[PDB]
Amino acid sequence: DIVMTQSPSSLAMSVGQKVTMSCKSSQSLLNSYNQENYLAWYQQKPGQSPKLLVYFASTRESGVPDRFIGSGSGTDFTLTISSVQAEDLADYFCQQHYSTPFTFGSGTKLEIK
Amino acid sequence: CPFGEVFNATRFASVYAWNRKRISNCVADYSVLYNSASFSTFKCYGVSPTKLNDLCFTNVYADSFVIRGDEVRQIAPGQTGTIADYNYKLPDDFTGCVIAWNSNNLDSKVGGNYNYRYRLFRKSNLKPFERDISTEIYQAGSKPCNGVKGFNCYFPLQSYGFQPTYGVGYQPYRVVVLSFELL
Amino acid sequence: VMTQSHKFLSTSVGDRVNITCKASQDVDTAVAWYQQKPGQSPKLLISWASTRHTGVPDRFTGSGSGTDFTLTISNVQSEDLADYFCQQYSPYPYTFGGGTKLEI
Amino acid sequence: QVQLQQPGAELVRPGASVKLSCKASGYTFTSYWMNWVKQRPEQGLEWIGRIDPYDSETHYNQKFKDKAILTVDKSSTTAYMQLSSLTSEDSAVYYCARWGTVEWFFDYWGQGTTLTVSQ
Amino acid sequence: QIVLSQSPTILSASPGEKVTMTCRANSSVGFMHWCQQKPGSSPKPWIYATSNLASGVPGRFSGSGSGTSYSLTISRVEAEDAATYYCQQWSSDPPTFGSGTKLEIK
Amino acid sequence: QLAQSGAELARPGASVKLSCKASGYTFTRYWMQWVKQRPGQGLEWIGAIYPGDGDSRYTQKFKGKATLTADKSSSTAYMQLSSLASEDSAVYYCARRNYYGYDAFAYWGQGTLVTVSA
Amino acid sequence: QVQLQQSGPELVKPGASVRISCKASGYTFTSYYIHWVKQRPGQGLEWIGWIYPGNVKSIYNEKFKGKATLTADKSSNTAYMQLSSLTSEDSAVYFCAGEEHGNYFDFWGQGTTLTVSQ
Ligand SMILES: *[C@@H]1O[C@H](CO)[C@@H](O[C@@H]2O[C@H](CO)[C@@H](O)[C@H](O)[C@H]2NC(C)=O)[C@H](O)[C@H]1NC(C)=O
Ligand SMILES: *[C@@H]1O[C@H](CO)[C@@H](O)[C@H](O)[C@H]1NC(C)=O
């Protein structure tokens, strides 16, 4: 099993700046065959179901906006929002994508200053 | 230890001309499987996948190919689709491991790859493991089209295109089908 | 359409020998070889051009891939005097090769 | 249109079992896997198990054996989850989430089931 | 945007010696094929993915590497092989060659 | 695991019907094949039959002469030639592949001497 | 032998639209990716773009987008690099390149050195 620690546990940033979160693991999450490292991210508005933001390493999904850009390969990862807006009032989960069990991370609450 | 020239081969074959390899006269380690966990789909039918070290098989096969993303789940006993019915059809008494993983760094091109075809049209369904390589023209209409390739006359091997920027579904997945049997 | 080099072949007991088959198209390691005694049917000898079928000793180290193929019986004894064939599995029809005979 | 409906809430006595459910609509049911994720407050999320609707090959987490039994139902295109012998530390939210053909990141989820264990 | 770096561009080597050359990468990549371009003529396909030798070379050429570091190792240098050696790269992106490898003898 | 064949003698103007018996496995799942052998000239492929429904394949040289029928119950395979000529005086074989589908020929049968000269 | 042949070396005026022919020979022309490259004298080999003959789709490098358009005749086994707006810096030999196997060229052509005039 892999332990996933997130170093900023609560975020407070005003509208219009670059927020940068983090997520870690224990094993190098990059399989040797295709060299395309595994992780996920999530966004859960309060009173609302969590929805996906960023699959494998840095690939945004279709319906999500262009502000969410992921990063990170191996052990240390950073999910970067470029310009934070008024609808980014949620928490942002890390997620283990490589092996079994699937061992989600903690939650980072983001509130607009 | 010959499970090192099928998994990380260089160029997997197309779906309609699917590759093969016969492993015999050596015992296998089965440590590349179920211990690296680099494989997404690992639907091992028949034998349970963990107790293969204390078993010894002869004349096993390693037929492998590369298909689109949203049709990995047709390589399975009894499922019907467009590549489990016209390209490579698994039998109902299959006993092995159906391995599959994403390989998008290695089997896609900016502007369509086009070298991984798939048989779109055929006269009838396939048998278990029956491969087809003939490129005779289909003449879907009642008029006999003798290789004109016009109205109701299609080239039957339509081509995939894997671009690197699609979604999950449209992406190359190098499936390998270990096909163990008794004796 | 397969083809052979020698229709007949003369090699002694203590000497090695190689039998070749050139192919018309490129067929990806999908040929066989056979051994036909003049009385009975040809038995399967080397399958998939590198692997060895059961009942055959470690003499027949068959190799070759791509277009050209090679079957190497190393130290031929007195009972390996027969006919040697070739095949191809992928393109219909399953065209064979010419019959070569190993003699002394 | 990828829909995952769920019941609103459930209330049970300590010492019972539940039959938690979620309904899938929008896609063909027998292609994608299913997954259940436990949301307890102040501990984040935890994976539970998975089911495959074609051939019911069910994995589980190590901590959640012999408490959570997973069950699929191809009739009426619904998924199911039977938790048994609930304790005090079961007041949580258990989603339903589908993916599993090609990868193991979950795109479409259910809205959430609230669980309560009291008198 | 996958830029590469064949750091030993000008390689000076007496014949019959073991010298090597490396090709640094950038973002993650798969395999790196190689081709040899003789000065003033058409190039030739030299190596496959990492160590399949494309059925036309002497057996002294054998290259290694995985991930984002790849190199080619020559066991013995010859006076025949005063030729450049390029490097493609297996990627979903468009291919891009290296910087050049002048194998010169001093 | 082994095949069983027969023996025949026919007229130069009549028609012949061969035979091949299969035993030791399930007959309705592998492709029984037929090859021919004149004195010399190598071997040539005739066709293949699938005993599940009779999905026959052929070669254009023997299309119109070779009729590949089978029976799932008796576990025997047949072929029938018609309008015999002088080139058909040969010995025929029946064979099976090793595994399903796409492999080498392993299980052969004995020879069927057929002379159609006079 | 399976080979690629091109046209001869040219020496034309600047600015004119220039054709460079490339003849397929031996391989099945409607299956191989037809790449094109550029070799400045003294500099490393660069890339231009490719053209599939099956269904003629072209993808260019971003530094050479209006400077070339690529055409290939399907039933004549030819390839064409229609250069446009020739300038004096474009004094470089432009090979053909045919491939199937990912980014690995099986073949090359006899290089057409196209040098500017003044
Ligand atoms: C190619 O696959 C083989 C196994 O089929 C790999 O061999 C093992 O791979 C794991 C993961 O890289 C290593 O931890 C082991 O040390 C390897 N064992 C051996 C015998 O080398 C091999 O590394 C793979 N090659 C690639 C492309 O990574
Ligand atoms: C290295 O690759 C990354 C990802 O493609 C790219 O963003 C970066 O600009 C590359 N380096 C250069 C200078 O091309």
mmCIF file of N, CA, C and O in Angstrom, chain D residues 31-69:
data_model
loop_
_atom_site.group_PDB
_atom_site.id
_atom_site.type_symbol
_atom_site.label_atom_id
_atom_site.label_comp_id
_atom_site.label_asym_id
_atom_site.label_seq_id
_atom_site.Cartn_x
_atom_site.Cartn_y
_atom_site.Cartn_z
ATOM 1 N N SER D 31 -19.813 -2.788 -20.277
ATOM 2 C CA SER D 31 -18.491 -2.493 -20.807
ATOM 3 C C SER D 31 -17.549 -1.995 -19.716
ATOM 4 O O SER D 31 -16.462 -2.551 -19.534
ATOM 5 N N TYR D 32 -17.961 -0.973 -18.971
ATOM 6 C CA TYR D 32 -17.107 -0.341 -17.976
ATOM 7 C C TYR D 32 -17.237 -1.024 -16.622
ATOM 8 O O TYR D 32 -18.300 -1.543 -16.277
ATOM 9 N N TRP D 33 -16.158 -0.985 -15.842
ATOM 10 C CA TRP D 33 -16.199 -1.466 -14.470
ATOM 11 C C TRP D 33 -16.971 -0.490 -13.581
ATOM 12 O O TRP D 33 -17.491 0.534 -14.030
ATOM 13 N N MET D 34 -17.028 -0.811 -12.294
ATOM 14 C CA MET D 34 -17.617 0.064 -11.291
ATOM 15 C C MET D 34 -16.701 0.093 -10.078
ATOM 16 O O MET D 34 -15.947 -0.854 -9.852
ATOM 17 N N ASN D 35 -16.752 1.177 -9.316
ATOM 18 C CA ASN D 35 -15.939 1.327 -8.118
ATOM 19 C C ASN D 35 -16.715 2.081 -7.055
ATOM 20 O O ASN D 35 -17.535 2.944 -7.371
ATOM 21 N N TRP D 36 -16.444 1.766 -5.796
ATOM 22 C CA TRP D 36 -17.079 2.439 -4.677
ATOM 23 C C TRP D 36 -16.012 3.074 -3.798
ATOM 24 O O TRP D 36 -14.996 2.453 -3.483
ATOM 25 N N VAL D 37 -16.244 4.326 -3.415
ATOM 26 C CA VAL D 37 -15.265 5.115 -2.674
ATOM 27 C C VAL D 37 -15.931 5.659 -1.419
ATOM 28 O O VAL D 37 -16.995 6.280 -1.493
ATOM 29 N N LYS D 38 -15.309 5.418 -0.268
ATOM 30 C CA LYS D 38 -15.844 5.834 1.021
ATOM 31 C C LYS D 38 -15.346 7.229 1.368
ATOM 32 O O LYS D 38 -14.137 7.461 1.429
ATOM 33 N N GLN D 39 -16.276 8.155 1.600
ATOM 34 C CA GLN D 39 -15.939 9.500 2.064
ATOM 35 C C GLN D 39 -16.385 9.630 3.513
ATOM 36 O O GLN D 39 -17.550 9.928 3.796
ATOM 37 N N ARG D 40 -15.461 9.374 4.423
ATOM 38 C CA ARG D 40 -15.668 9.809 5.795
ATOM 39 C C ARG D 40 -15.007 11.171 5.985
ATOM 40 O O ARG D 40 -13.953 11.425 5.393
ATOM 41 N N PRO D 41 -15.621 12.084 6.744
ATOM 42 C CA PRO D 41 -14.966 13.366 7.035
ATOM 43 C C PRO D 41 -13.674 13.187 7.821
ATOM 44 O O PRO D 41 -13.467 12.178 8.493
ATOM 45 N N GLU D 42 -12.771 14.156 7.643
ATOM 46 C CA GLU D 42 -11.449 14.279 8.288
ATOM 47 C C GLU D 42 -10.539 13.039 8.140
ATOM 48 O O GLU D 42 -9.504 12.942 8.807
ATOM 49 N N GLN D 43 -10.841 12.114 7.225
ATOM 50 C CA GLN D 43 -9.872 11.104 6.818
ATOM 51 C C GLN D 43 -9.735 10.961 5.309
ATOM 52 O O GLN D 43 -9.071 10.022 4.854
ATOM 53 N N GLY D 44 -10.337 11.851 4.523
ATOM 54 C CA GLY D 44 -10.208 11.745 3.085
ATOM 55 C C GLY D 44 -11.070 10.631 2.520
ATOM 56 O O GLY D 44 -12.120 10.278 3.063
ATOM 57 N N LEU D 45 -10.612 10.065 1.410
ATOM 58 C CA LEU D 45 -11.342 9.017 0.719
ATOM 59 C C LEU D 45 -10.580 7.702 0.812
ATOM 60 O O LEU D 45 -9.364 7.676 1.021
ATOM 61 N N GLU D 46 -11.312 6.600 0.657
ATOM 62 C CA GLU D 46 -10.721 5.268 0.679
ATOM 63 C C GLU D 46 -11.401 4.390 -0.358
ATOM 64 O O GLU D 46 -12.631 4.379 -0.456
ATOM 65 N N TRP D 47 -10.598 3.665 -1.130
ATOM 66 C CA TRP D 47 -11.130 2.717 -2.097
ATOM 67 C C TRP D 47 -11.697 1.499 -1.377
ATOM 68 O O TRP D 47 -11.242 1.126 -0.293
ATOM 69 N N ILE D 48 -12.713 0.883 -1.978
ATOM 70 C CA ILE D 48 -13.378 -0.256 -1.355
ATOM 71 C C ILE D 48 -13.202 -1.510 -2.199
ATOM 72 O O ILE D 48 -12.606 -2.494 -1.749
ATOM 73 N N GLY D 49 -13.722 -1.492 -3.418
ATOM 74 C CA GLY D 49 -13.620 -2.650 -4.278
ATOM 75 C C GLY D 49 -13.960 -2.306 -5.709
ATOM 76 O O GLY D 49 -13.924 -1.141 -6.104
ATOM 77 N N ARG D 50 -14.296 -3.338 -6.480
ATOM 78 C CA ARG D 50 -14.703 -3.153 -7.865
ATOM 79 C C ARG D 50 -15.474 -4.376 -8.334
ATOM 80 O O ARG D 50 -15.283 -5.479 -7.820
ATOM 81 N N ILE D 51 -16.346 -4.166 -9.317
ATOM 82 C CA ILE D 51 -17.083 -5.243 -9.969
ATOM 83 C C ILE D 51 -17.007 -5.060 -11.472
ATOM 84 O O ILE D 51 -16.923 -3.934 -11.972
ATOM 85 N N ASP D 52 -17.032 -6.161 -12.183
ATOM 86 C CA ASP D 52 -17.137 -6.106 -13.629
ATOM 87 C C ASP D 52 -18.465 -6.694 -14.062
ATOM 88 O O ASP D 52 -18.756 -7.852 -13.738
ATOM 89 N N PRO D 53 -19.287 -5.936 -14.788
ATOM 90 C CA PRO D 53 -20.657 -6.392 -15.063
ATOM 91 C C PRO D 53 -20.768 -7.506 -16.085
ATOM 92 O O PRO D 53 -21.843 -8.112 -16.186
ATOM 93 N N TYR D 54 -19.719 -7.800 -16.847
ATOM 94 C CA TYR D 54 -19.795 -8.928 -17.767
ATOM 95 C C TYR D 54 -19.501 -10.227 -17.029
ATOM 96 O O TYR D 54 -20.353 -11.117 -16.954
ATOM 97 N N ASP D 55 -18.298 -10.340 -16.479
ATOM 98 C CA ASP D 55 -17.907 -11.458 -15.633
ATOM 99 C C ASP D 55 -17.566 -10.881 -14.268
ATOM 100 O O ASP D 55 -16.622 -10.095 -14.143
ATOM 101 N N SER D 56 -18.319 -11.283 -13.244
ATOM 102 C CA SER D 56 -18.258 -10.640 -11.930
ATOM 103 C C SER D 56 -16.994 -11.062 -11.179
ATOM 104 O O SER D 56 -17.021 -11.824 -10.211
ATOM 105 N N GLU D 57 -15.863 -10.538 -11.641
ATOM 106 C CA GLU D 57 -14.597 -10.700 -10.940
ATOM 107 C C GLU D 57 -14.435 -9.539 -9.971
ATOM 108 O O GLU D 57 -14.227 -8.398 -10.395
ATOM 109 N N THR D 58 -14.523 -9.827 -8.678
ATOM 110 C CA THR D 58 -14.601 -8.801 -7.651
ATOM 111 C C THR D 58 -13.320 -8.784 -6.835
ATOM 112 O O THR D 58 -12.969 -9.788 -6.208
ATOM 113 N N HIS D 59 -12.631 -7.652 -6.842
ATOM 114 C CA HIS D 59 -11.525 -7.405 -5.932
ATOM 115 C C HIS D 59 -12.023 -6.606 -4.737
ATOM 116 O O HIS D 59 -13.148 -6.104 -4.724
ATOM 117 N N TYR D 60 -11.163 -6.483 -3.728
ATOM 118 C CA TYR D 60 -11.514 -5.745 -2.524
ATOM 119 C C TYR D 60 -10.262 -5.122 -1.932
ATOM 120 O O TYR D 60 -9.137 -5.468 -2.298
ATOM 121 N N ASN D 61 -10.475 -4.187 -1.016
ATOM 122 C CA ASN D 61 -9.387 -3.648 -0.222
ATOM 123 C C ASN D 61 -9.042 -4.617 0.904
ATOM 124 O O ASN D 61 -9.811 -5.519 1.236
ATOM 125 N N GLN D 62 -7.858 -4.426 1.486
ATOM 126 C CA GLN D 62 -7.424 -5.299 2.570
ATOM 127 C C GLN D 62 -8.190 -5.013 3.854
ATOM 128 O O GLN D 62 -8.587 -5.942 4.566
ATOM 129 N N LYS D 63 -8.427 -3.737 4.154
ATOM 130 C CA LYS D 63 -9.117 -3.371 5.382
ATOM 131 C C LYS D 63 -10.615 -3.643 5.337
ATOM 132 O O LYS D 63 -11.256 -3.627 6.393
ATOM 133 N N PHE D 64 -11.189 -3.896 4.160
ATOM 134 C CA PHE D 64 -12.639 -3.952 4.014
ATOM 135 C C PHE D 64 -13.141 -5.340 3.641
ATOM 136 O O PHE D 64 -14.272 -5.470 3.164
ATOM 137 N N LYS D 65 -12.331 -6.378 3.838
ATOM 138 C CA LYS D 65 -12.828 -7.733 3.657
ATOM 139 C C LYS D 65 -13.827 -8.094 4.752
ATOM 140 O O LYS D 65 -13.827 -7.518 5.841
ATOM 141 N N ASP D 66 -14.716 -9.038 4.404
ATOM 142 C CA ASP D 66 -15.799 -9.619 5.235
ATOM 143 C C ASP D 66 -16.663 -8.579 5.960
ATOM 144 O O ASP D 66 -17.260 -8.865 7.000
ATOM 145 N N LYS D 67 -16.750 -7.379 5.412
ATOM 146 C CA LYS D 67 -17.683 -6.347 5.842
ATOM 147 C C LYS D 67 -18.459 -5.768 4.673
ATOM 148 O O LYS D 67 -19.645 -5.462 4.816
ATOM 149 N N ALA D 68 -17.822 -5.631 3.513
ATOM 150 C CA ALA D 68 -18.439 -5.087 2.312
ATOM 151 C C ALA D 68 -18.426 -6.156 1.233
ATOM 152 O O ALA D 68 -17.355 -6.622 0.832
ATOM 153 N N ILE D 69 -19.608 -6.543 0.766
ATOM 154 C CA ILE D 69 -19.754 -7.517 -0.307
ATOM 155 C C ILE D 69 -20.366 -6.805 -1.501
ATOM 156 O O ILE D 69 -21.406 -6.151 -1.373
#
